[PDB]
């Protein structure tokens, strides 16, 4: 993602961060979040085992 | 082009941000000036457009 | 910008016949509006504008009288009105666009219409 | 020092369009494949301009 | 017996950097804080920092 001189890290639909710009070496770097997700168990009851 | 305002879509960058804090209520424009030795007279008259 | 203009008619000589301009795509008041005919078989002659603005008319030589130029600002459509037609007058009349520069027009015609045929016989 | 022009004809001007001219980017927010409201100065489409 | 969702999981970050500009030279406080004389309300001074 090119980025014009005039302008700083963008945005996304969510007004959260995706891309910024570097302060010393002026490049452009992607943000995403890391991994993550739900967590499910599963039992047979607390009967069994 | 020739002599219209040609049809069409641009979007404008950003050029730079002058913080003055002046009151403006009126605006002119600054046009250039040819002088040769085709125009005769003196300054407020021997000028071409 | 289009310059449409009436279809072709044909009249018996003696009568007076109207042929309308429109145009569209532009700022009718900005420019003025000059007028040109063709007969067949020959070049192009010149009988004078109208100003958009006031409307006043300026006839050339050979053309007073007979043809009538006039327009409107609403509508926004030009107007050719020829009175008293014989043989001499069957040619096809294009509108010419002359932009407004003042008192003295220049000779640049950039657009023009599709032209309006008549034809004067018995 | 200043000098007056001469020799040159006064007219009134004249009018055009402008065809969706006018258009700026309105923040220096970088934005892909999305529609943007913004509520900002802008020339309107389809104006008079001198 | 069955499903249930009871939490989530996330990657803890490993550590911390932190992008600040190339830049060593100090703001001039003192120039606007130890001023000989100060202008009036009216006709306030204006000073860029950068
Ligand atoms: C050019 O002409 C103008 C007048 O069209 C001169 O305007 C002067 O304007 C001030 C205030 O705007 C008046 O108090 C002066 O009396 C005007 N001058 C005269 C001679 O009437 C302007 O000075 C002219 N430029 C130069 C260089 O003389
Ligand atoms: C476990 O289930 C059996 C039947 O499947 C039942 O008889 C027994 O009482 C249960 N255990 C407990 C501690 O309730
Ligand atoms: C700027 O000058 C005009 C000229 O009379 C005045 O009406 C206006 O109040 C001034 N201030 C601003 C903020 O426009
Ligand atoms: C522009 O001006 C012309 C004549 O002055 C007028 O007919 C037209 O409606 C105007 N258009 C706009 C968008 O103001």
């Known amino acids: 993602k090119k980025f014009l001189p005039f302008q700083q890290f963008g945005r996304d639909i969510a007004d959260t961060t995706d891309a910024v710009r570097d302060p010393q070496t002026l490049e452009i770097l992607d943000i995403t979040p890391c991994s993550f997700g739900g967590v499910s168990v599963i039992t047979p009851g607390t009967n069994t085992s | 082009l020739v002599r219209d305002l040609p049809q069409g879509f641009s979007a404008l960058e950003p050029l730079v941000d002058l913080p003055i804090g002046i009151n403006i209520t009126r605006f002119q424009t600054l046009l250039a000036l040819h002088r040769s030795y085709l125009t005769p007279g003196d300054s407020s008259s021997g000028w071409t457009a | 910008v289009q310059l449409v203009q009436s279809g072709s008619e044909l009249k018996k000589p003696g009568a007076s016949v109207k042929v309308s301009c429109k145009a569209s795509?532009?700022?009718?008041?900005?420019?003025?509006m000059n007028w040109v005919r063709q007969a067949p078989g020959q070049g192009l002659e010149w009988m004078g504008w109208?100003?958009?603005?006031?409307?006043?008319?300026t006839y050339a030589q050979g053309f007073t009288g007979r043809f009538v130029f006039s327009l409107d600002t609403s509508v926004s459509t030009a107007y050719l009105q020829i009175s008293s037609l014989k043989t001499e007058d069957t040619a096809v009349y294009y509108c010419?666009?002359?932009?407004?520069?003042?008192?003295?027009?220049?000779?640049?015609?950039?657009?023009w219409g599709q032209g309006t045929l008549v034809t004067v016989s018995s | 020092q200043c000098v007056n022009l001469t020799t040159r004809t006064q007219l009134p001007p004249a009018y055009t369009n402008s065809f969706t001219r006018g258009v700026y980017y309105p923040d220096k927010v970088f934005r892909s494949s999305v529609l943007h409201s913004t509520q900002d100065l802008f020339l309107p489409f389809f104006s008079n301009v001198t | 017996k069955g499903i249930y969702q009871t939490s989530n999981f996330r990657v803890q970050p490993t550590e911390s950097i932190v992008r600040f500009p190339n830049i060593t030279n100090l703001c001039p406080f003192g120039e606007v804080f130890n001023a000989t004389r100060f202008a009036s309300v009216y006709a306030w001074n204006r000073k860029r920092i950068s």
């Open positions: 795509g532009y700022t009718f008041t900005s420019y003025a």
């Open positions: 109208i100003n958009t603005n006031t409307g006043n008319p």
């Open positions: 010419a666009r002359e932009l407004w520069f003042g008192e003295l027009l220049s000779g640049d015609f950039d657009y």
